[PDB]
Amino acid sequence: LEPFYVERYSWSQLKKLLADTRKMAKAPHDFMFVKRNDPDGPHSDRIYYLAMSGENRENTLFYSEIPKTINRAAVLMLSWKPLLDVGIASYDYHQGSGTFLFQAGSGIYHVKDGGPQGFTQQPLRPNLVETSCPNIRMDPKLCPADPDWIAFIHSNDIWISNIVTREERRLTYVHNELANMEEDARSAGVATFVLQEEFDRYSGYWWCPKAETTPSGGKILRILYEENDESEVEIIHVTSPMLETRRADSFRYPKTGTANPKVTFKMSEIMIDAEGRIIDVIDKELIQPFEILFEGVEYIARAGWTPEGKYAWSILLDRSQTRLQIVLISPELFIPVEDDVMERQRLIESVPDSVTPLIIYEETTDIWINIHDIFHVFPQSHEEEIEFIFASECKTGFRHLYKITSILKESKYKRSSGGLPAPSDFKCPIKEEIAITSGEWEVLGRHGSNIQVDEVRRLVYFEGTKDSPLEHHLYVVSYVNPGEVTRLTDRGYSHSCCISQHCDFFISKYSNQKNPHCVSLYKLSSPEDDPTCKTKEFWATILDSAGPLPDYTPPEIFSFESTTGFTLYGMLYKPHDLQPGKKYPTVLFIYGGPQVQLVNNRFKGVKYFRLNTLASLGYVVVVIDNRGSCHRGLKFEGAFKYKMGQIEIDDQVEGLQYLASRYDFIDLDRVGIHGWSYGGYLSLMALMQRSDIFRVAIAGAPVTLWIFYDTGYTERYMGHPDQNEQGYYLGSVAMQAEKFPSEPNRLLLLHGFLDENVHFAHTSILLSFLVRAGKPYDLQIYPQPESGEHYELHLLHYLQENLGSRIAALKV
Amino acid sequence: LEPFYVERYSWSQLKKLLADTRAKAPHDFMFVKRNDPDGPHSDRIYYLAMSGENRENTLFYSEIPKTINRAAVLMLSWKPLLDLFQVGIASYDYHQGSGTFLFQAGSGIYHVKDGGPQGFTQQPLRPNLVETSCPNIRMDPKLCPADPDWIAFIHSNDIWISNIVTREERRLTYVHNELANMEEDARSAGVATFVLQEEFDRYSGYWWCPKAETTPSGGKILRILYEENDESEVEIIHVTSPMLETRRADSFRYPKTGTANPKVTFKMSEIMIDAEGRIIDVIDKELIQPFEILFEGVEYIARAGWTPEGKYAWSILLDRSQTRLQIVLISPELFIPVEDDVMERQRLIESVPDSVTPLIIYEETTDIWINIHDIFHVFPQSHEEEIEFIFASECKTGFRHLYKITSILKESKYKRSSGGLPAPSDFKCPIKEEIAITSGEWEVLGRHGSNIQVDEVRRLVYFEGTKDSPLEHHLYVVSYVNPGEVTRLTDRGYSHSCCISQHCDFFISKYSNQKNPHCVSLYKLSSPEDDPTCKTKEFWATILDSAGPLPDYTPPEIFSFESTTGFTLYGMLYKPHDLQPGKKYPTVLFIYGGPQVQLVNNRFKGVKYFRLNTLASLGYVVVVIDNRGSCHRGLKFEGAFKYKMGQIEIDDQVEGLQYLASRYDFIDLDRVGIHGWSYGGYLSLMALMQRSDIFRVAIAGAPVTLWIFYDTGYTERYMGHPDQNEQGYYLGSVAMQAEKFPSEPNRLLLLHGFLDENVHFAHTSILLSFLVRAGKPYDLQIYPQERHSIRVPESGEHYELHLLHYLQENLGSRIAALKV
Ligand SMILES: *C(=O)C(CC)(CC)C(=O)Nc1cccc(CN2CCN(Cc3cccc4ccccc34)CC2)c1
Ligand SMILES: *C(=O)C(CC)(CC)C(=O)Nc1cccc(CN2CCN(Cc3cccc4ccccc34)CC2)c1
């Protein structure tokens, strides 16, 4: 077996090769189905959606017409009608009025379509909402009880504005923009850094869905909101976008072990008169402190209202993220904010002791709670019950849907006597807990995956891995008599689905390893003898695939039975034009951290197109989902709890050796490893731990030191740093710099200079320690499109010079 | 001619080689007379010195004997002046009449007495801590010449005084609130700001008046002239921290070019003391009119102080473009008390005479630039409306020469009663007499410790100069009354740095040459009885002896060549050790090539530039060339690159390289590297950028890549304001020309300290921005927790290792040629 050496191109030649082979658009999303209700017309529904019609183009609202019937000989390809005349990330909509509300650039706008006004046959010039406010407005939302009112955030405070009367009003006075950020570290209605970055919650205020009627023929609107105080949170400096303006932007980063923000709930209570004028605005706070009522709660993971507006709800986590509580909060728990201590005591006495927080569900785990967007609340039939669907990995170690009924008891605790409540004083007895689904597979509830409930047929639609861990599929099952789980999506593809609100259609964005992404509309229907049985039928195409592009050769998914007692899956890019009796240099691409799966049956020729490019130059490319990876259940994921950096490279090496024994073209002498973020971290660990296996390591934005990363992430997987002193040490490459090679041309560090999730300090502290330890490195910095081209060029060239070509074999 | 290829050592082996192949000489001298007829010693000398190796800098003394055995060589012994502190001393004060030393060692401020009325110790004295109530580090202590019981110092950017007998402490300025943040509180007093320290070498910002003023009580008044600065309009910049654990950035005020400099003014603290040394009162006083009115056009207070009598406070002032110097006498009567009440403030202005006025006793201009220097000697004032003084200037002849100047102190034409602003030349004085003491194609030295000693008895002036050569500094002497013959006092084949006794009967010289390490030796001055002008020198004793030519270090040969520019350009050449016949070697050009610096001269370079020899041992030719713009050749030679930085320098570097390359066949022009720090890093980039043909690799260290990111004081002196010179700034900024770099990798290495506060990392990061935009390759190395230069030895060790290894892998070795 002779060594194959890659063609040694020049820098300018490699730039040309990358430029030629380079030459995507946001696929249709945020679907909404509106009925036409037109007996004489040919269309049943209009679908509205956000999309990008070309690659240059900006993201905007489109519509398409769903016909009542189709020619089943042909394939109907739906046309994209523009709804409007900068760019839109999301949109709100009120059904009854047909009002869209959306931000585009700095402006907030509104149009109407598909309400009583009817259905336009051409673009709509939208109406700009007026404002006195000097700064950018964020997070606009229509009031569900009155589409004339909207809310939004300006300078970390909540405002409301009437789109008819033009009345604007600031609701919270929590942030003063002109003062310094040391004293004023407060905010209302905005989610803090950790909650956005690590729990995917972006909004921090919620309209009450219904309005209460006043005595004099007006109404009361309500906004539940989160108020944060980040005064005790660590302040860190990262260099500003403008390098000519030599300064640093301050922001609050709760690093692991330190304080999270000081959180609490609030309610704005807005009295409006008979003709839409604001009478009064009472701001209201909890009767007792957040720490007392919600003992142990550190993070407000999720929050909203019940469909009737009766209770606000919230899904709450402790600091270790091992205990989740779903908690109903009455509006009567809130009293007006009064600085006068005598008048404050009055208002506490006026509230009954019966009014109390209601923990309607609690769960625990020795691993961790993964937060998700599934939580469906049924309408309240009985007065002292709440019925709902939730998902959990805590029973079986796999995420499944459960139908739960809780009893809303009077609390044992009484506030009159004025003590502190015990841990379980607000817990509700669980009357029923039916498991809707079960097995060695999971229901999906993140990154857009959720459920749709058909209350009439008493069915729930959900996405899952039942058929395979490498394919997402749409399923349906009864929540009343749960049994047979009907699949609705076709095997051989992975699907991301959106079910119509009327449960009579669904859209699926699907692909597989060979075929690019497509979006198609499927009609749901039942046989006459049984509404429980659900069948699907292709209706029309919304987006066609480009068709497998000859320049891109896809990988083969493989798998091996690991000594760890798990099947591990991988992707293998065999080199283009294999020579018999030769062995090629192998580049292992890695991520390997939690909340990610790189190996699955989806089209990888957009995101990971440049893996195919490495294979065209003569490299073998391997990707392996090690233990900790997503979509295999909680026990699989928990493998590295307290032990980050200590099991991942075993699984990689094991898979790399499995491939080697079966394919003689893999040259274990010339193996490189490369990844970004956790992949960059593991790449450093690979070179540190296994010099023998890995010749080169390219680390991108690597986490080098876990005490520098945030609370929400790090404490979930590694606990508090006091209770895992060794794991934090052994898991931190910056404090083991002595273990790196004394040879140069084996370590490449890549970092963005301004990156604020994985800070540059991770790289700069490593560099400092490598210099202390007399170790070599190579460094590329990317301050501030053009730099991604530079990155790909440098990486191809670095692999060429130090792994692929004959010059690399000489160099040693 | 075969190419020599250097040994390809591993990283571990180069670390070994460097590790294997890996102290302040006496200074701040002071002669004090014994006045002991029966004793064997004429003088005792005091001096700062590091006794050797890992040891702190401290006060020593030695004994100067009346006679010597001229058969033998006397070696003086160093007596420790101080005892161990129940850290190190950089600087000291002395009061002649009392014997009081004053100095800072570590945090504390101390005093001893020796050589005054109390006599001379024969054993180390115990230093006496000056006690304090101040919470923070005290800085810049200074003895009051008028009363050696009193001292002054800076604490939290304000001026304080402390009596060392009575123990009375007192705050004189309330300009800086130490507790409030620096974004609001950006004022200071008695402290030279960044640009003044970094670009004009002025460190102090307050000056004791050297004489007291007696009162009716039998007490006295003491005065302190001081600079007050308001940096509120000055650009703020954030650099990280020695603490990398806290992801945080510390702020400071950096006047970047074409932006606001600090808003400055003069102030005076009037300090009334009673009959037994207790403070009665402290009146803080300000100028009767603004600084912008009284000193029209002035932007930098370059130097300041008092006349010997304490009558006038002098100052040397510059305009923003640094093409106009003004020496100005400021009378104490120009200052009035500070007053909020605008009626009472007006009444004090009116009580001051109109005859009292600033006196511009000297003014000069140039098309090139003013170079500030420490030479300025005021004579005692005998005539009432005349001041007589020695100054130095390049503005007449284009070489720095001494001039004895007398100016007439006329009452001003301008009058303050009328209430108009004065005309540009209302304060100017008549120049009655301006005699040139020296002249020629050579300069008098007045920076970096070089100065003059005036013998007022025999009416002579001692000075350092380049008269015998630009490659050697020598001590000379000449009359200031009948200026004729310039007598050299130091021996040739040696560069000297000399300190002349206050009594003018001795001088000490620190000297070296290319082959011999540094030495310090004492020399007695005397004249034949018939003629006191004729000054001769005799060796007296050795203070510091040579370690000797160390056999690791082979010196370089000083070469020179006639450039097409019409200047002789001097250089140094390190030939490779064991130079093979019929073989050619990879060359490494070390460069600085910026203003205010000369790399090529006849001094020992085996300490500072030791690794140029290490390069030669591995088989590299090493060249160094002082191009046009460099120091010690006159203002015209220096002026060559005004408005044109980065354009002319490499022409001279390549010319010199080719002078050697034609004259020596061992110089392989196909493999030439370049390397430098600061301006040398700048030029290293420019060299590769402009001359891809000549230079294979460039290793730029802390490079200036964008002149708009550098400070006012430096950049505007050589380039003017950016508004007036858009082409100069564009053509002189490598960041704006990133497209011109090679599109071959392994030819560009950037080295930068992450926390550098003179040449900010910003220069490197913005260069990397434009190189990425231009699709160009680079290599980069960062050295965190390190400011101006590389202080931590492990990072210095890493710097030398990477630099040597980089040259090996991409220039010197077998594989380097195969790699193309
Ligand atoms: C970490 O999670 C980060 C940074 C904190 C979050 C945004 C991160 O993921 N950053 C980041 C930056 C730049 C690119 C990517 C993803 N990209 C996917 C495709 N991949 C192409 C590739 C892969 C393997 C080998 C090569 C070799 C040469 C050229 C391209 C290659 C690069 C990484 C993520
Ligand atoms: C510029 O003015 C700086 C940086 C902004 C502030 C003072 C500066 O000068 N920095 C700096 C950092 C580190 C070292 C030096 C000076 N040093 C002198 C000796 N020289 C040795 C040398 C020369 C040439 C080649 C080699 C090769 C290997 C090892 C040493 C070499 C290096 C620079 C200044």
Ligand SMILES: [Cl-]
């Ligand atoms: Cl929506």
Ligand SMILES: [Cl-]
């Ligand atoms: Cl002195």
